[PDB]
Design a protein around this ligand. Structure first.
Ligand SMILES: O=c1ccn([C@@H]2O[C@H](COP(=O)(O)OP(=O)(O)O)[C@@H](O)[C@H]2O)c(=O)[nH]1
Ligand SMILES: [Cl-]
Ligand code: NA
Ligand code: NA
Length: 360
């Protein structure tokens, strides 16, 4: 058959949850009718297939006390409005606060709703939001999670929880056979906020051999609050790092890069550590809270570093950039994990979840 599937998400900016949603929608939009309701006006950062319909909610003032109060009430009823007109067989909502809003807005409407979490359980820190997540999530029809630790946490107060890995859209484009002409390039792709911890990337570059810094180009793809602070630590440390802002063609960067470094403290299942697999990019990652070992088998598929260890990241960096035959062997083993993130297999596991919850 064919189903109307409505995705609900706050924004569609250069983030991981957004990348997965566009990947899923683009895959489902051929055989089903998929719409996307987003709170933020503006165009999707990721290329979206013409068949998926995107509707952005009204824009509301937030400058004054009356509007800060009124806009939220107006936002809720515009979302309840959009849900009714979508005429969907199923709703799929993304990320913590938007899941709760959909739980409430969907009250009354006769369509099942699937919520999905994307960071670890622990990334949501405020005491109050952890509570509203606890009382409201039992009222969903199913919950998609990324790791086994989050499955165990939510299963005790959510009845249907399914673990669905992130699908990588590069598994369609990039053929599993391609040779790469690597350059002396090292990537840090991610948001420039505290948890991504990009300062660890900078301090680790400063501790690299003078030969490596002189003959390698280090770039930071992404943006965030810490952008200007990092620009000044690059001068404080006296290194050469190329800030690129948000980048559409990460395929080009992944195509030339030899190493990608992830330095986060807490993560669910980082897509930069998945996308890298298709481009023979060597992953060096901090042992972020939880995931870690299921993406990187240390010294076999990649290199792991303790959390916030600027020197350990530097020694691992020199290991790979001073031993191309070892980085190649590290990276050829990583190719085995490509099958785990193929779009076609993961789309069919969402379709099982959708028809399973559609038995209401
Ligand atoms: O300048 C950028 C920065 C990031 N991304 C994409 O945004 C995603 C990052 O998601 P991640 O797995 O790191 O999880 P998140 O940091 O969003 O929680 C990746 O697919 C990147 O390819 C991008 O396309 N351009
Ligand atoms: Cl994510
Ligand atoms: Na705000
Ligand atoms: Na993530």
């Amino acid at each position: 058959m064919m189903m109307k599937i409505s995705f609900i998400i706050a924004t569609l900016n250069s983030g991981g949850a957004e990348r997965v949603l566009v990947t899923l929608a683009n895959a489902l939009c051929k055989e089903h009718e998929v719409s996307i309701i987003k709170f933020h006006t503006g165009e999707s950062f990721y290329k979206l297939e013409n068949e998926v319909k995107v509707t952005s909610l009204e824009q509301f003032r937030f400058d004054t006390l009356y509007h800060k109060i009124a806009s939220r009430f107006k936002k809720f009823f515009a979302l309840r409005k959009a849900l009714k007109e979508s005429k969907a067989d199923v709703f799929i909502s993304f990320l913590d606060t938007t899941n709760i809003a959909c739980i409430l807005a969907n009250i009354g409407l006769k369509t099942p709703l699937i919520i999905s979490e994307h960071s670890n359980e622990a990334y949501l820190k405020p005491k109050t939001w952890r509570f509203l997540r606890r009382v409201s999530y039992p009222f969903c029809d199913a919950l998609s999670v990324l790791g086994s630790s989050d499955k165990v946490y939510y299963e005790r107060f959510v009845k249907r929880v399914k673990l669905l890995l992130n699908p990588c859209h590069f598994s369609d484009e990039i053929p599993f056979d391609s040779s790469f002409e690597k350059e002396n390039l090292v990537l840090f792709i991610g948001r420039l906020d505290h948890n991504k911890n990009p300062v660890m990337f900078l301090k680790a570059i400063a501790h690299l051999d003078k030969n490596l810094q002189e003959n390698y180009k280090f770039v930071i793809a992404g943006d965030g609050e810490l952008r200007q602070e990092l620009e000044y630590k690059v001068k404080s440390l006296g290194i050469k790092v190329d800030f690129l802002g948000r980048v559409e063609n990460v395929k080009a960067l992944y195509e030339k890069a030899k190493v990608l470094c992830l330095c986060s403290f807490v993560e669910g299942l980082p897509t930069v550590l998945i996308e890298s697999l298709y481009f023979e990019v060597c992953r060096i990652s901090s042992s972020y809270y939880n995931g870690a070992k299921d993406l990187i088998k240390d010294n076999h598929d990649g290199l792991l570093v303790g959390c916030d260890d600027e020197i350990a990241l530097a020694k691992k960096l020199e290991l790979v950039l001073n031993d191309e035959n070892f980085r190649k062997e590290l990276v050829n083993n990583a190719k085995q994990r490509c099958k785990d993130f193929e779009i076609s297999n993961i789309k069919e596991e969402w379709l099982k979840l959708i028809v399973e919850v559609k038995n209401a």
